[PDB]
Design a protein around this ligand. Sequence first.
Ligand code: CA
Length: 116
Amino acid sequence: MGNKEKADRQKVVSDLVALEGALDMYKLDNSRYPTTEQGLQALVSAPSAEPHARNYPEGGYIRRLPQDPWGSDYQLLSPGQHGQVDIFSLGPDGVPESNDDIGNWTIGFHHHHHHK
Ligand SMILES: [Ca+2]
């Protein structure tokens, strides 16, 4: 409980949105959502994995892999647990797919994907 945690996780959400944006941008060019490596790298540099991302910004949107303020490298899992691709943050504990793991479903961005 505190103000610190809110500020840290909001910073997490900011990068989280950027992560998903890289995914959407990769989908724009390659007409599909990126895999675990390609998704995180899409913010930095065009993935070497096929198909090779085109129309990518020089230096990327962020020159280095975005990380939780505690020093954790954001993780992507394709195919996602909730959708096609799920992005989650490791938090202070660095543990992926954990309760703490701040994902797009956690914040409330993981919508528009219900077959029912
Ligand atoms: Ca965690």
